[PDB]
């Protein structure tokens, strides 16, 4: 054929891929974490947005730290050969490097490690997108007037 | 013949490292509200890093906190894009 370039990811496989949304609103009382009012508005906006981009969306609510790690493990063991990409959205409390389950924390590196190039082979070479709405510490930005 | 195992990841964080992230109890979080609006308007038009750049500008210019507590009042936010991608990403194709 004619001249061909390779500067963009191939996105015309038969499926766009999975979009997993983890929405943690209510936490166990012993943790002392407050309820995250407004997060169901976020989860519904994301489901409609990624539906229109032709992602297979799966929504999960109020998961424990054990449930988050078992979900991520099982999803990374599916066959993604006919999928172009992978998307995961996390909505919860957090600190630097950490996201909370309803009963305690999960390191973010533990979650993304299931999708590494050597451990999820049907996603090797394909874009893996993690979107994170959570605190990363306790500093506040005072801004500057323009 | 090999690629790094950490290649082809993108992390779209709602706030800068070390900072709180803001959420409105009626309207949703500043970052997700803004992300969904910019995907709706530009996913058929712009590459994904340029969409996330417009999300950074919307969060930084259009939101400011309101609180009866002086410590938490009149505060601002900037999201943080972390890319290990090796190619351009478009949500549409030919």
């Amino acid at each position: 054929s004619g001249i061909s370039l390779d500067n963009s990811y191939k996105m015309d496989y038969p499926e766009m891929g999975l979009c997993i949304i983890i929405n943690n609103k209510n936490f166990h009382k012993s943790t002392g974490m407050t309820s995250r009012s407004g997060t169901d508005v976020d989860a519904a906006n994301l489901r409609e947005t990624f539906r229109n981009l032709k992602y297979e969306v799966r929504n999960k609510n109020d998961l424990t730290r054990e449930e988050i790690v078992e979900l991520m493990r099982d999803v990374s063991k599916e066959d993604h050969s006919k999928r172009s990409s992978f998307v995961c959205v996390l909505l919860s409390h957090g600190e630097e490097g950490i996201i909370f389950g309803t009963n305690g924390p999960v390191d973010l590196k533990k979650i993304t490690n299931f999708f590494r190039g050597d451990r999820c082979r049907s996603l090797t070479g394909k874009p893996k997108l993690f979107i994170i709405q959570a605190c990363r510490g306790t500093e506040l930005d005072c801004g500057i007037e323009t | 013949h090999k690629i790094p195992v950490e290649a082809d990841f993108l992390y779209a964080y709602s706030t800068a490292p070390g900072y709180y992230s803001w959420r409105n109890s009626k309207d949703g979080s500043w970052f997700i509200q803004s992300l969904c609006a910019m995907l709706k308007q530009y996913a058929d038009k712009l590459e994904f890093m340029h969409i996330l750049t417009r999300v950074n500008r919307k969060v930084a210019t259009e939101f400011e906190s309101f609180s009866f507590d002086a410590t938490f009042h009149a505060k601002k936010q900037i999201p943080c894009i972390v890319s290990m991608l090796t190619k351009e990403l478009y949500f549409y194709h030919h």
Partner: peptide
């Protein structure tokens, strides 16, 4: 407005 609340923080995460």
């Amino acid at each position: 407005d609340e923080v995460x």
